[PDB]
RNA sequence: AGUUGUUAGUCUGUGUGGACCGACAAGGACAGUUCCAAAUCGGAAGCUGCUUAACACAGUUCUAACA
């Protein structure tokens, strides 16, 4: 009695709920939920058709079978395998079959990336068919049944069938029953003809012991077969484990055109940087021939090695354990990494059209134009790099930085790479998308802050110079910013995010933000353009990815696509996105039709009256900062002109490609940066505006402590900081503003904070002091906010508004459960236990500053 | 394998429709006197001293078990 079927016995008797249990012990579970949701409303993008499409992801990352040429799906069903096959390199032709019918599932007809390769045909049993030459075979066929000699016979039935397609290609058939010694037999004659491995899919469920036989790798069938047999015993008794949790597949969308996707680099622009990088990887540099790269180049790869909850915090929180947003959070490796950036970085957007590009032109020469009426370009200097990088103004590592800034050679490292510049030529500025590489990365920084600084350091994009941009203004004042905006005459105020900003700007985008170099002096030009057309137009990029024999770095690089981690991102950003709402209102206002879009030269007299006539008033309803926009048109046909935005390219995000935007009316609602805003009264009759947003993320972030250092005077400290924050800038929430009371109160008073909370631009940081919060709150809405004409202090925390509690619950409070109440009397306890964990320092109870307490 | 459904009760929304209103407050929540609401009284309407409906349609209301 082999060790399958005494396991297929024990699980045949097992009960309803032991079943339901034990079928989801310990396995990776994807959530499709939202695809659920999705395909029952009726997308036809991003979204798998199944949770076949995951199921074949986790073989084809581990190189375990490698989809090539023309791709023929046995038993595709609904076609999650061959929709997931339709967007990879190699693949040229998907051809599926399935039985279909009455009891079975049929294909479901979509437009994710790749469609207008795949071929579907119903109503065909595969087992009557005319084999065909494939160069990959994937089969998903089986019936999974309580008796395990039926089975058997289905499996030795499909293995049978499936033989005569096997010459030598690329394959992945699914067995559902490989504990039974024909089959074994058969499984052991098959690998000898034919090669590969048996493997176990972890995204399987429990209640099978279902495996998959596969033509890259090798091993031993018998061993492997008792291997998950022996898992599946173990799993019978281990204690229940929660599933864990994996996130759906992402599919893109569009046709797909294998003979446009390979892009060919100026190497006589990328070659010094490649050669570098060789140089000093050369033990194990060598050209790897399996790269997943479609849209990108590739260049090679070098091998290298592959690289927690607060507790202060948690500790004064407990009753947002059991929320799951709260937990989510909390929950990079080279896997997720790789999936990433196959989903969101590896497309390519088509070019616009011959219209639009020359508006696009018009657009940016008059933006250009406006932005410096009053201001000019400058060079930066070192000092103001240095002084920036010692007040620490993404990551901790800022100590290394400041040494190297402090240090002599390194300034002669960037002397000379900036030689090389004026040159024409880049020797060393390559950035990751994860001490001399140290030194080369931070040079390279310097150098792009030194030739498109002033874009920051002289507030090119600041509401009062912009008439659009929101630089300087800080949480505090994005809500009156917002406000003053609706009083404005017009339709509605559309947010229409946009799905990966950074990775869908046209060669047409760079060479637009490039005019800017038409207004400098020539010292200043060279080394401008220098930049832009030698580090942004043409980027090298590192990237991990897992192989079989460990981590390789690759070397990519590629021209579009505007790298997240560069200075001046943030301001060509928003410029791209001023002037794209600049031609989306264009259009909606009727100026910009389609066929003034398809011909190749549109007459621009109209276009420039336009303008000059009407932008800047247009360009103060709204309100931009990177990719996040609130745009108040005059009518509501800017929710139908959508031609100009997706011919560029920016495709809204969650959102049918041309179902018309939906803008709200109430702007306390209206999105922005990832904020909406309130608009409180006080006792005295005077209105305050504030930021809001669901509470769970904020108790989230306050408990993932980020290498804050393990030292608890440093996560105190944090802790003490989030606190701050939350008292400053969103203390209008019960919960909140007790959470902060009650920590404000176990940390000791003398204690600085440090390890700033957030990363975001519009963050002051008022909150990094020592002081009595209340005179800080009031510097920053009383005193210093132009929007209150009334000056008259706040003289204690009861004054200080709150939000309406029905308001209050709906952005995820949890005022009325059981649960916080009793947390919310005890806090004395929990108070009382930090302050003995800490030590013997001195305590303030700030619990007396609410009238529960007192 | 992928897919994954019924049954009964309960919370929304709407309509039909006489189909509700006010005062009040036990108690709870909240910590800004800020909100819930039993029980009671008063009125309103219906069928004669008693009642505050019932049904319909839809849910990612919740519940509870069955394929
Ligand atoms: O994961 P999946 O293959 O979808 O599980 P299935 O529901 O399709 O069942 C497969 C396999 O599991 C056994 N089984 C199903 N339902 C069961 C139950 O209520 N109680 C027991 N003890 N076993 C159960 C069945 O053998 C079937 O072949
Ligand atoms: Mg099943
Ligand atoms: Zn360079
Ligand atoms: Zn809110």
Redesign the pocket.
Known sequence: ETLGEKWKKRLNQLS?KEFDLYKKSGITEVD???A??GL?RGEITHHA????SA?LQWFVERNMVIPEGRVIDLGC??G?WSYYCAGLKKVTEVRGYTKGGP???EPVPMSTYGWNIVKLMSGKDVFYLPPEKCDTLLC?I???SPSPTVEESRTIRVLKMVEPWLKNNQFCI?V?NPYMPTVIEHLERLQRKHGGMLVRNP???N??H?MYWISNGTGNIVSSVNMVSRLLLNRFTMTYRRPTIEKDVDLGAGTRHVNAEPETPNMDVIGERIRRIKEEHSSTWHYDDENPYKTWAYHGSYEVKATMINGVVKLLTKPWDVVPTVTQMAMTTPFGQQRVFKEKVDTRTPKPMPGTRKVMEITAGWLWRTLGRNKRPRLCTREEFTKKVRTNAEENQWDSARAAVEDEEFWKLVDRERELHKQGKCGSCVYNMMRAIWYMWLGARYLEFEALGFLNEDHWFSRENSYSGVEGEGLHKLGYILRDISKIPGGAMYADDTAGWDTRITEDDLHNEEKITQQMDPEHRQLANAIFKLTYQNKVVKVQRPTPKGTVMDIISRKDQRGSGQVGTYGLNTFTNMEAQLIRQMEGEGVLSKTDLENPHLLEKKITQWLETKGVERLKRMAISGDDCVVKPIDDRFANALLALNDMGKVRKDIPQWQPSKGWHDWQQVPFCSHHFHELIM?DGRKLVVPCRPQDELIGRARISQGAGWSLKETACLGKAYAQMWALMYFHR??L??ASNAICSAVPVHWVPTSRTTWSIHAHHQWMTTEDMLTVWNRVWIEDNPWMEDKTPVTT??????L???EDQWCGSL????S??TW??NILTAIQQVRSLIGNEEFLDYMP????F?
């Open positions: 309803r499709r939920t939202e659920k949701e029952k058709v199944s949770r076949g199921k069903g609904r999650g009891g079975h599932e998903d089986g019936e999974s699914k559902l995204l399987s469920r209640s099978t279902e006792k019960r919960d503003r007790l925390w009861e004054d200080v508004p709150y309406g509690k029905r005022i009325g459960l059981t916080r109440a919310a009397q500053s609410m009238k529960r007192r």
